[PDB]
Design a protein around this motif. Structure first.
Motif, PDB file in Angstrom:
ATOM      1  N   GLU A 131      99.164  60.008   3.570  1.00 38.97           N
ATOM      2  CA  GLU A 131      97.864  59.990   2.895  1.00 38.97           C
ATOM      3  C   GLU A 131      97.035  58.787   3.330  1.00 38.97           C
ATOM      4  OE1 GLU A 131      97.187  61.782  -1.246  1.00 38.97           O
ATOM      5  OE2 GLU A 131      99.267  61.084  -1.348  1.00 38.97           O
TER       6      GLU A 131
ATOM      7  N   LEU B  58      90.894  71.857  -2.532  1.00 40.04           N
ATOM      8  CA  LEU B  58      90.158  71.815  -1.275  1.00 40.04           C
ATOM      9  C   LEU B  58      88.828  72.526  -1.473  1.00 40.04           C
ATOM     10  CD1 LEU B  58      93.015  71.048  -0.273  1.00 40.04           C
ATOM     11  CD2 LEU B  58      92.727  72.621   1.605  1.00 40.04           C
TER      12      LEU B  58
ATOM     13  N   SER C  53      92.296  68.279   5.844  1.00 43.49           N
ATOM     14  CA  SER C  53      93.707  68.063   5.553  1.00 43.49           C
ATOM     15  C   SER C  53      93.989  66.570   5.496  1.00 43.49           C
ATOM     16  CB  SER C  53      94.602  68.740   6.595  1.00 43.49           C
ATOM     17  OG  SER C  53      94.387  68.164   7.874  1.00 43.49           O
ATOM     18  N   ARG C  54      95.206  66.246   5.082  1.00 44.86           N
ATOM     19  CA  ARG C  54      95.685  64.876   4.990  1.00 44.86           C
ATOM     20  C   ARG C  54      97.034  64.784   5.688  1.00 44.86           C
ATOM     21  NH1 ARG C  54      94.459  62.351  -1.125  1.00 44.86           N
ATOM     22  NH2 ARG C  54      92.192  62.177  -0.722  1.00 44.86           N
TER      23      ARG C  54
ATOM     24  N   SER D  88      95.582  64.970  -3.843  1.00 45.53           N
ATOM     25  CA  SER D  88      96.549  64.923  -2.742  1.00 45.53           C
ATOM     26  C   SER D  88      96.753  66.282  -2.072  1.00 45.53           C
ATOM     27  CB  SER D  88      97.897  64.356  -3.193  1.00 45.53           C
ATOM     28  OG  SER D  88      97.752  62.996  -3.547  1.00 45.53           O
ATOM     29  N   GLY D  89      95.702  67.083  -1.983  1.00 43.77           N
ATOM     30  CA  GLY D  89      95.806  68.408  -1.414  1.00 43.77           C
ATOM     31  C   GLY D  89      95.805  69.533  -2.425  1.00 43.77           C
TER      32      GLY D  89
ATOM     33  N   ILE E   6      88.866  66.966  -0.036  1.00 38.93           N
ATOM     34  CA  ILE E   6      90.245  67.181  -0.423  1.00 38.93           C
ATOM     35  C   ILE E   6      90.541  66.242  -1.574  1.00 38.93           C
ATOM     36  CG2 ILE E   6      91.046  65.576   1.374  1.00 38.93           C
ATOM     37  CD1 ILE E   6      93.593  67.534   1.466  1.00 38.93           C
TER      38      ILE E   6
ATOM     39  N   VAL F  84      92.549  61.387   6.687  1.00 44.54           N
ATOM     40  CA  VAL F  84      92.010  62.697   6.340  1.00 44.54           C
ATOM     41  C   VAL F  84      91.378  63.284   7.593  1.00 44.54           C
ATOM     42  CG1 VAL F  84      90.307  63.959   4.980  1.00 44.54           C
ATOM     43  CG2 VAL F  84      91.691  62.180   3.906  1.00 44.54           C
TER      44      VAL F  84
ATOM     45  N   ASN G 195     100.960  63.073   5.833  1.00 45.88           N
ATOM     46  CA  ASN G 195     101.961  62.867   4.793  1.00 45.88           C
ATOM     47  C   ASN G 195     101.795  61.516   4.114  1.00 45.88           C
ATOM     48  OD1 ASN G 195     104.239  64.385   7.115  1.00 45.88           O
ATOM     49  ND2 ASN G 195     103.043  65.386   5.490  1.00 45.88           N
TER      50      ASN G 195
END
Length: 122
Positions: free
Chosen positions: A75, A57, A70-71, A53-54, A50, A78, A73
């Protein structure tokens, strides 16, 4: 960044696991975070990453549609959700981080966790 994985274990085929990678010292903002895995006797291979910051992918062919990266909020974590696990997924899974471009070669990642073991029995 100092990286620590968790969430590994031993499961029956068809089951799920959720791996997590936590960052210490810094947040993951400004880093590409990738998952790699090493099956016994084999070399480390790319699983997912990732980045941005998203915004980007990446998934390896063998895990697409079964694994989700995914991450959170903040950060600071992961996640790697692993569904429909197969014995072929058996490996040590490593979290890795780097500044710069999202690449799939382990050679370019500067930070590595110690790894969490994932075992899928048939």
């Amino acid at each position: 960044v100092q990286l620590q994985e968790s969430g590994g274990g031993l499961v029956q085929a068809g089951g799920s696991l959720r791996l997590s990678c936590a960052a210490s010292g810094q947040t993951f903002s400004g880093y590409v975070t990738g998952w790699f895995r090493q099956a016994p006797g084999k070399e480390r291979e790319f699983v997912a990453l990732i980045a941005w910051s998203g915004g980007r992918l990446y998934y390896a062919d063998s895990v697409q549609g079964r694994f989700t990266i995914s991450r959170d909020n903040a950060e600071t974590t992961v996640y790697l959700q692993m569904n429909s696990l197969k014995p072929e997924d058996t490996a040590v899974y490593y979290c890795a981080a780097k500044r710069g471009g999202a690449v799939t070669a382990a050679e370019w990642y500067d930070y590595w966790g110690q790894g969490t073991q994932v075992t899928v029995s048939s």
